[PDB]
Amino acid sequence: KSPLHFAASYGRINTCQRLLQDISDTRLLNEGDL
């Protein structure tokens, strides 16, 4: 949750790619942290 927000916030593309490739259900991109 928090690591994905941090990576997307500061353009860490490698972390986002290696984190969002785990599953194809897409339950992490659609969320709001505060």
Partner: protein, 39 residues
């Protein structure tokens, strides 16, 4: 007028250098690696 124009050019140069510096710092944040505080 000459002094005011010189001050304006100095401020414009400061602004341009600040844009370049901000871009460099954004690159530093983008490319640096973190292994301890990964939350």
């Amino acid at each position: 007028e000459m002094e005011i124009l010189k001050q304006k050019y100095r401020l414009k140069d400061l602004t341009f250098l600040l844009e370049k510096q901000h871009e460099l710092i954004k690159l530093i944040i983008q490319k640096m690696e973190i292994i301890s505080e990964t939350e």
